[PDB]
Amino acid sequence: GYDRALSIFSPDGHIFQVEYALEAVKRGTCAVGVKGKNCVVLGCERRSTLKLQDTRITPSKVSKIDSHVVLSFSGLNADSRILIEKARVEAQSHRLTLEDPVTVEYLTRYVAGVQQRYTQSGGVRPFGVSTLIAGFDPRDDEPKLYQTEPSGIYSSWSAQTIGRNSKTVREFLEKNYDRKEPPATVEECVKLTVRSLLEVVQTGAKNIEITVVKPDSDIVALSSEEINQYVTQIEQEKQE
Amino acid sequence: GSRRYDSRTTIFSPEGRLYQVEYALESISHAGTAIGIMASDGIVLAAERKVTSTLLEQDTSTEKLYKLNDKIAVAVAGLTADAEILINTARIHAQNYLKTYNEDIPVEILVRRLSDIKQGYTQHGGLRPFGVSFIYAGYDDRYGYQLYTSNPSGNYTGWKAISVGANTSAAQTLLQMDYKDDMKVDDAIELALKTLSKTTDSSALTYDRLEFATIRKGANDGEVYQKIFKPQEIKDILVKTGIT
Amino acid sequence: QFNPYGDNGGTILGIAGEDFAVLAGDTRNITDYSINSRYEPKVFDCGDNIVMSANGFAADGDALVKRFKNSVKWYHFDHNDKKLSINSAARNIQHLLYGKRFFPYYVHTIIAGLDEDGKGAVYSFDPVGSYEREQCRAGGAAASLIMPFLDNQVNFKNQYEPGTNGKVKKPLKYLSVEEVIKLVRDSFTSATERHIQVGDGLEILIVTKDGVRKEFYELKRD
Amino acid sequence: MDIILGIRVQDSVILASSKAVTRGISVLKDSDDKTRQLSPHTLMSFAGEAGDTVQFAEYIQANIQLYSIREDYELSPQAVSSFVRQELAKSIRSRRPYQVNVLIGGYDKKKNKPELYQIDYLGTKVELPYGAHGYSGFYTFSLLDHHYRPDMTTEEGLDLLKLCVQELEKRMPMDFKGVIVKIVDKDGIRQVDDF
Amino acid sequence: TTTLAFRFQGGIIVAVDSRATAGNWVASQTVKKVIEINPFLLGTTAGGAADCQFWETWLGSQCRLHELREKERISVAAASKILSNLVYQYKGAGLSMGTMICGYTRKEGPTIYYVDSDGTRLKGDIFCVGSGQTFAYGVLDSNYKWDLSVEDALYLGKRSILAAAHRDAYSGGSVNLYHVTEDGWIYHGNHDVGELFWKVKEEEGSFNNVIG
Amino acid sequence: TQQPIVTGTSVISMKYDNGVIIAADNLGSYGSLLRFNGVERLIPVGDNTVVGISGDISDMQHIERLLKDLVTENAYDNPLADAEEALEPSYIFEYLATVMYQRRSKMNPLWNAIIVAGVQSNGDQFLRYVNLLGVTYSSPTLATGFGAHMANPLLRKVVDRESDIPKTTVQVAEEAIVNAMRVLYYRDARSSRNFSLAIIDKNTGLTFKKNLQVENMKWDFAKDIKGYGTQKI
Amino acid sequence: NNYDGDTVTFSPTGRLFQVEYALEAIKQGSVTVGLRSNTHAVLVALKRNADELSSYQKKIIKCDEHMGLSLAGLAPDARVLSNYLRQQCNYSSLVFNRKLAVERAGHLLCDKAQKNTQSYGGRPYGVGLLIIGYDKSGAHLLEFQPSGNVTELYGTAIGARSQGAKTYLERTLDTFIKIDGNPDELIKAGVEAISQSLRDESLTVDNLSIAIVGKDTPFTIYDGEAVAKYI
Amino acid sequence: DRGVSTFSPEGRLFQVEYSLEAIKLGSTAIGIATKEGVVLGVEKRATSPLLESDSIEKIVEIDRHIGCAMSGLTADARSMIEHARTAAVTHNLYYDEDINVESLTQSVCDLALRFGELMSRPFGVALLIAGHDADDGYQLFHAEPSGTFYRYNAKAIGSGSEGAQAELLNEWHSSLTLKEAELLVLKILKQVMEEKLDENNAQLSCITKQDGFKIYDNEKTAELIKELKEKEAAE
Ligand SMILES: *[B]([O])([O])[C]([C][C]([C])[C])[N]C(=O)[C]([C]C1=[C][C]=[C][C]=[C]1)[N]C(=O)C1=[C]N=[C][C]=N1
Numbered sequence A: 001g002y003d004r005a006l007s008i009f010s011p012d013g014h015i016f017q018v019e020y021a022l023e024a025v026k027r028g029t030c031a032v033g034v035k036g037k038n039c040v041v042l043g044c045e046r047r048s049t050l051k052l053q054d055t056r057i058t059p060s061k062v063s064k065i066d067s068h069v070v071l072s073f074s075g076l077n078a079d080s081r082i083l084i085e086k087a088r089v090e091a092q093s094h095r096l097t098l099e100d101p102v103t104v105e106y107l108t109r110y111v112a113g114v115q116q117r118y119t120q121s122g123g124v125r126p127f128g129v130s131t132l133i134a135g136f137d138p139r140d141d142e143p144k145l146y147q148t149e150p151s152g153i154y155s156s157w158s159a160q161t162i163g164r165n166s167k168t169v170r171e172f173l174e175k176n177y178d179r180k181e182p183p184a185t186v187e188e189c190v191k192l193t194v195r196s197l198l199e200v201v202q203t204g205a206k207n208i209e210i211t212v213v214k215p216d217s218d219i220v221a222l223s224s225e226e227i228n229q230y231v232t233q234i235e236q237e238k239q240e
Numbered sequence B: 001g002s003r004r005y006d007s008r009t010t011i012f013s014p015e016g017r018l019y020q021v022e023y024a025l026e027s028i029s030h031a032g033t034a035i036g037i038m039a040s041d042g043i044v045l046a047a048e049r050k051v052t053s054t055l056l057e058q059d060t061s062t063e064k065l066y067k068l069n070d071k072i073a074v075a076v077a078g079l080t081a082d083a084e085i086l087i088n089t090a091r092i093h094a095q096n097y098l099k100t101y102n103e104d105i106p107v108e109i110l111v112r113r114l115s116d117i118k119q120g121y122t123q124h125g126g127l128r129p130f131g132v133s134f135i136y137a138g139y140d141d142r143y144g145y146q147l148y149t150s151n152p153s154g155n156y157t158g159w160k161a162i163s164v165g166a167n168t169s170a171a172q173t174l175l176q177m178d179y180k181d182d183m184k185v186d187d188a189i190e191l192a193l194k195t196l197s198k199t200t201d202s203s204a205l206t207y208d209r210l211e212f213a214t215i216r217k218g219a220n221d222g223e224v225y226q227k228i229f230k231p232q233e234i235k236d237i238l239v240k241t242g243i244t
Numbered sequence C: 001q002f003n004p005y006g007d008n009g010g011t012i013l014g015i016a017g018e019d020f021a022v023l024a025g026d027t028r029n030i031t032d033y034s035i036n037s038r039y040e041p042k043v044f045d046c047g048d049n050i051v052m053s054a055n056g057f058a059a060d061g062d063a064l065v066k067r068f069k070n071s072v073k074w075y076h077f078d079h080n081d082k083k084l085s086i087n088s089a090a091r092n093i094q095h096l097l098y099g100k101r102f103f104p105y106y107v108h109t110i111i112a113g114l115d116e117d118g119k120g121a122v123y124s125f126d127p128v129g130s131y132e133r134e135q136c137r138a139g140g141a142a143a144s145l146i147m148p149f150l151d152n153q154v155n156f157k158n159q160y161e162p163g164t165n166g167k168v169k170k171p172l173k174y175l176s177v178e179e180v181i182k183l184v185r186d187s188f189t190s191a192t193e194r195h196i197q198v199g200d201g202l203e204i205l206i207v208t209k210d211g212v213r214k215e216f217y218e219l220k221r222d
Numbered sequence D: 001m002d003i004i005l006g007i008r009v010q011d012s013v014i015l016a017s018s019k020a021v022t023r024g025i026s027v028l029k030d031s032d033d034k035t036r037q038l039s040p041h042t043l044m045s046f047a048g049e050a051g052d053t054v055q056f057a058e059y060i061q062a063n064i065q066l067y068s069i070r071e072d073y074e075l076s077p078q079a080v081s082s083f084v085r086q087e088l089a090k091s092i093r094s095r096r097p098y099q100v101n102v103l104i105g106g107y108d109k110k111k112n113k114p115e116l117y118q119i120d121y122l123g124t125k126v127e128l129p130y131g132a133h134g135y136s137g138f139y140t141f142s143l144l145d146h147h148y149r150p151d152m153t154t155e156e157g158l159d160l161l162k163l164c165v166q167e168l169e170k171r172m173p174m175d176f177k178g179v180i181v182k183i184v185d186k187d188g189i190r191q192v193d194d195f
Numbered sequence E: 001t002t003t004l005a006f007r008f009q010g011g012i013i014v015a016v017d018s019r020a021t022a023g024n025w026v027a028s029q030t031v032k033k034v035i036e037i038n039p040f041l042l043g044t045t046a047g048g049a050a051d052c053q054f055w056e057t058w059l060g061s062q063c064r065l066h067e068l069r070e071k072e073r074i075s076v077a078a079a080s081k082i083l084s085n086l087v088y089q090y091k092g093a094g095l096s097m098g099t100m101i102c103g104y105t106r107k108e109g110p111t112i113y114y115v116d117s118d119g120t121r122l123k124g125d126i127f128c129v130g131s132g133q134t135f136a137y138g139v140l141d142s143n144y145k146w147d148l149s150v151e152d153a154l155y156l157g158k159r160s161i162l163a164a165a166h167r168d169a170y171s172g173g174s175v176n177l178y179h180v181t182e183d184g185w186i187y188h189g190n191h192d193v194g195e196l197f198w199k200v201k202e203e204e205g206s207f208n209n210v211i212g
Numbered sequence F: 001t002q003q004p005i006v007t008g009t010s011v012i013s014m015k016y017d018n019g020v021i022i023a024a025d026n027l028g029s030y031g032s033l034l035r036f037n038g039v040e041r042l043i044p045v046g047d048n049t050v051v052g053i054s055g056d057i058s059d060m061q062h063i064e065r066l067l068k069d070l071v072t073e074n075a076y077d078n079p080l081a082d083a084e085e086a087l088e089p090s091y092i093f094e095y096l097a098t099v100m101y102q103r104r105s106k107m108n109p110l111w112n113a114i115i116v117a118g119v120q121s122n123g124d125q126f127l128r129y130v131n132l133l134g135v136t137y138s139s140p141t142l143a144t145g146f147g148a149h150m151a152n153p154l155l156r157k158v159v160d161r162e163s164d165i166p167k168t169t170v171q172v173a174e175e176a177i178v179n180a181m182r183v184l185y186y187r188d189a190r191s192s193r194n195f196s197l198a199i200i201d202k203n204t205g206l207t208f209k210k211n212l213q214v215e216n217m218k219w220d221f222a223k224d225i226k227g228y229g230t231q232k233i
Numbered sequence G: 001n002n003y004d005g006d007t008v009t010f011s012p013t014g015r016l017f018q019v020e021y022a023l024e025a026i027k028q029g030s031v032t033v034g035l036r037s038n039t040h041a042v043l044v045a046l047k048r049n050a051d052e053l054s055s056y057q058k059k060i061i062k063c064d065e066h067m068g069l070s071l072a073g074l075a076p077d078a079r080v081l082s083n084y085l086r087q088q089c090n091y092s093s094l095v096f097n098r099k100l101a102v103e104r105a106g107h108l109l110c111d112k113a114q115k116n117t118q119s120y121g122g123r124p125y126g127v128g129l130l131i132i133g134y135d136k137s138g139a140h141l142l143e144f145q146p147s148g149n150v151t152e153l154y155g156t157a158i159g160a161r162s163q164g165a166k167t168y169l170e171r172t173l174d175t176f177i178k179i180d181g182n183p184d185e186l187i188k189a190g191v192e193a194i195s196q197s198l199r200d201e202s203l204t205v206d207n208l209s210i211a212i213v214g215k216d217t218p219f220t221i222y223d224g225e226a227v228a229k230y231i
Numbered sequence H: 001d002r003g004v005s006t007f008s009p010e011g012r013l014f015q016v017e018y019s020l021e022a023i024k025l026g027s028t029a030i031g032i033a034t035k036e037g038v039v040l041g042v043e044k045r046a047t048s049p050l051l052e053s054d055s056i057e058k059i060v061e062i063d064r065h066i067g068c069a070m071s072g073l074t075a076d077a078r079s080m081i082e083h084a085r086t087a088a089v090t091h092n093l094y095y096d097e098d099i100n101v102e103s104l105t106q107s108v109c110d111l112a113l114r115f116g117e118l119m120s121r122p123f124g125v126a127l128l129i130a131g132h133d134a135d136d137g138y139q140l141f142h143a144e145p146s147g148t149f150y151r152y153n154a155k156a157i158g159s160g161s162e163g164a165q166a167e168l169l170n171e172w173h174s175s176l177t178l179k180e181a182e183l184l185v186l187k188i189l190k191q192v193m194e195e196k197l198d199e200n201n202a203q204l205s206c207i208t209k210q211d212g213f214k215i216y217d218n219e220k221t222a223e224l225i226k227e228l229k230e231k232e233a234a235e
């Protein structure tokens, strides 16, 4: 078998293949995650260079791992499918043996462990993908939002963004998000998520996708018209 | 040892691109243009054979359009030999699904499976990727008529109208201009041929330089028919649309 | 058909004292109605103040002892010459025995020594590794003859105090090393009389804080 | 385990399964639910050798739930039954086969029809209006042959099911400790708590 | 062997006998048929001594690894299923095990799972397992209520093992009592049947058949 | 698992004051057929060890090749191969015992009973038994097969315990072995008159005697035995 | 230069640079001395510390009751090789009831190290070993190099500044060989030998490490206040 | 290119030496051993204020009597921790006892050099393994990707290591109490850290014979930080 060590250290103590995988994430479309008091919202950018697309059948950016957890990403689309499939298999395996669905932290730890494994295994390159994993633990009403990256490190975030121009939207979230009082309602949380994407997106038409996840496996994806109403209200308040 | 001669086909560039995928896409950009157009009552697949000869036996020839099952077909852009490897794998996958569930495979599931195979060659194994881009035209009872494309990266996307191979930039602009949502198959046939006729590097578009196919519900009652056009049938539709 | 098991007879006996422990065993080795040897040592010093005997099928018995002695050696190498405690040895032996759960060592194993508080310890095993710390245990062919006698004369079972008539039990006073050796010798003499696979000689290993001592006694050779 | 019954009526499928679990000479439990929900509109009951039954049922459950998440779509009862049959057909030529017989009751939301499939441990699948595994059918099929009509309501199906259980309680030697009854229709799966 | 466990108001009572036999030969009267998996989990042993004791000792290692990895104690459901899935892999090889996995957690409350070597895994309120299980069932079923005091529940468990120790030839020796609560299990002593029988006979007025 | 085909009968042996004696007849039986009359079943290893083998002859020849190969291997990169680092009886035995127990554990035994007789470096007598089951034991006298039942009783009258070994000379020990071989010829239906005998002494070394015969047999009394009870003629 | 990328490449003058670079790792290691008489064999090792808070790296490893070694270079490689020796000593005991000859132990180490110098992918061992032992032919001392070369000697030293101790032993050859039935005097000679390799630092109580094996003396290691006697 | 297991002309493994450079870039971790216990402390170093700092897990339990702190590419530590936990629990299963801290460390270090062309590269993380056993008492070990481990009375690893180690050189003595050690870790962490030290960006832990391994609450650490400020202002 092909056993070549692709991910290796350099004289300055860097693993360039892992670092170049982050550059692939930097190229990917922007993804954002914001958790409120009783919800988490996942915002995703759709680049409008591709029109004549069939939005019914085109792979959506946000993927359900289980009925209570979701996963969005930035980076290589093909790579993301492999992580999502493994995550979905592990979710069912956990239910089968532990007789309880995965916690959001556990699922994140698994996905992060897969990513790490691909940074010191022979004959493989790292995943060019960073993920945002969000949801609610079984029988728990505390919102959960985690991030992973090609190196395999993961951590919890009150709010976070990844992908292209993520530096800008992170700048926005850092000044606008208050920890002592997070978005109390679904409306406030979605509004803040759409606002953060409007700093980068371009047009607020079909370029913004929003997915709201609530406790007890209550997940729903907002439509174009529903999102367009948020876009309208934000700019009308801005004209002042 | 052997390390000396390894090209390392599955690595990132400093910019975060996959060298071999990018170079495979460059190869595909010189291949004959293939176009897919999805309508409300069917799907059209049109493709240009590359600089043919008068001594090529056309009626028994097949380099662009292939049948995966009774409901799904593909248009090829790139290395034909690479494509046939993947086509035979896709045909088997469709039959495995049919044996397991006793139902025809949904289009997206077939597309995802092939796209995953392509992805694998970019991440592990140390082999070169498949220098192939597919346009998938298919039907199932969930989403109805569907158009997809996949490329050597293993990434796939859904489309209303799409082109692969040569002059896709020019072709996509023309499709984006004249395409409408309430369009029908007969109109889509005309759009496909007109787009090829303008983007072609050849002097004139003729029957012997084309492969053509449709997937219609235009079959007796609730069912789907695949029609791979014969040379004479391509010649007739060229006269009908007013190109020759 | 090939039968991979055999029966080499013999009998063993472990008794735990207050600050000592003994492991005894006869020196006769047999197959069917023949004597192989009148003196074939069966109880072994395994190091770290632990004595061991694996009675039954001698080939499996030797194999197990050999592997445990090996385990003690590697325990020293891997853990900075640390002394293997009797409880740790017992758990290790369980895994050696259960490792061959589906092709068992056909033996009854007994180890003896001192626990980490310096008190006398005897552990007893079945062929597939189930074990238990005991104050008293006989093993092997004549185990059914010896154990009841030890229940009576070591644990004072079914004994009460005169005058009270079944009301007050006989108190469980501790036994000295001289008192235990008497019970061991009488156990084996009695077993030799009524069991054909027991005889020739008795070898006793006594374990104290000072180390491992040996005593040998003649048994009837018929 | 012992008795599992199935009946497909006009607009639903009804599965009845005994509550007893017996090992040797003791009834260890009298409230055991011998079924698993594979999907919102598909239920599978099971009976066979101890351990194998639950292990197989939960394995199938996990696979269908995995499919549901991956495609965001519920498989048809026919598709699920074919998947289950293939697993059992694969199993019968294994080193140690799954010794499990199953009934699959589902409501096809596409065709708006209830469907009942009987599959044994060999991988023998049949679609039926009513079915049973083990010695149950030796009693219940004669009753069902007489009374069953294809346009029965759910309430009529339950009454006909009570007549089956009454016959079993009269003539079968084993005390199976009654049955848990579940109904599968367009609205999903629900349990009849009083039977 | 006679082992039982039952749920009640004050948690769980676990009671076991102490006898081990090889045919008609009494191999031991001092066997520990309850295994302390952790301060909140107990396992009972019936059938093959080595099988039960090896794999329940092994189960404790798996449970300890779970709480190290997950920073949270393992559920009784998950602990029982680790054992049942393990023995299921060995099915047909000839393992002989009849066990109860007994514990308490916040999410579950007091829980008992019957796990055996055929792969059977059952949640329940009352279980008796072993050669003398039928004898224990007689006393338990006629006297069981949810509203039992810790003191009365303990005696019922003790008395049920005694009943089986008397009638079942392969049960006896002594009775080990455990009481599992919200704050963990609590050992309640070794009770020799040789003394317990006469004590119960005199005080309770039972066993009038026997002469004393 | 198999069955023995061509077989060798008893191997007998004992210790004496300065060494050990071992003997075995020269027969290779094929069931009740006394097929091969020139089979050597005592195989010397160096000048300090003799391995006597009974049971399956095909497995004996395999073991013979292993020992031959063992000597070759020991000589490799060994300047003291004919001195301090020569093969000892204890080394040879332990090797065989390992192989025998390994083979029985794979359910494919070498169908033999083996006695390794020799003298160690320090002059100590070595005599130990091993068989197809991997069972091992040592004793002042050792014998396989019928020898165990008939030879041991006779040899144990000479050396009954360890303290009798220094009191037993080589002449007395050899006499007892030769008598035992005669008794086996009287009573073992799968024995032959012809046998080999080997003495390993700490002083005089290895003495290997071939083509020995059972002699001084008592048969004359047979003429007086008539009928099976009542018959007079 | 161009021929040092891997172990599978000879240079134009017939040299194996990766093996030579592995040899260099030994020279960087702390000094250790080995010497023997007819009755006993002694190892003396100067242990090295990272800093004042750190412990002094152990240099001596026991392989059997009658054999052991001292290391200089990559310690993990010494652990791998010593583990192999333990197994080989143990195989000899279990199968043949025979204590492994020190000469044969050297042959086994040579062959194990050699395979790593001829195959692609692997690397040479980066450690040198001094093996002492007492077997059926008396006391022995071996020097192991990861090139594969093993040499039996009366005395030697390896590591940094080892040339000083090696010269001393070359002068003292006739004296220390005669130290029979006197372990303390043989150790004294070893401690005096390793002292010739010292600069700036001197032998302290937690710095020095000594081991001995002999006629009626199992392989035992002395550290801490047990070696204060010899300082 | 060149082999992964290649020696440099100086006699060092290139990849091992390069992994040590990655560890220097890592966040600071400090360990101090006393007769009353061993203290382990780390710098969390959150990359952004939106990152919930309590999810940063750089101090980890291996067993009840053994704890562990990390520095460098912390993702690489997960398989090392898993192995350590398994080794600890497995030894308890085989021997019915706690495993020695040194033996546990040795088991972890056996993984280190299992790389070639096994894993494709060395670990890019250093570990401070602290614990207690009956034989050698309270112990602190520094496990490197070279496969080498040193025992230490006190040790600092990460970006501010040489500065912290020099400070530990002067401050450590054999009669230190547990409380004195806790404050000393906090003092040195505060010195080498970029951002100002508080309970949210720094974490403490200890291992004692009685209570075993414990990660300190943010409320408990906050008091020790306040106690530190006052005693420094006292002179
Ligand atoms: B109990 O009777 O099931 C008992 C429990 C076990 C934990 C000691 N088992 C045994 O006594 C078994 C035999 C048996 C008797 C009756 C039913 C089932 C099994 N005996 C042993 O496991 C055993 C162990 N060591 C020595 C002898 N016998």
Ligand SMILES: [Mg+2]
Binding pocket: C221, C222
């Ligand atoms: Mg007799």
Ligand SMILES: [Mg+2]
Binding pocket: D118, D119, D120, D124, D125, D126
């Ligand atoms: Mg059927």
Ligand SMILES: [Mg+2]
Binding pocket: E081, E082, E083, E085, E086
């Ligand atoms: Mg398991």
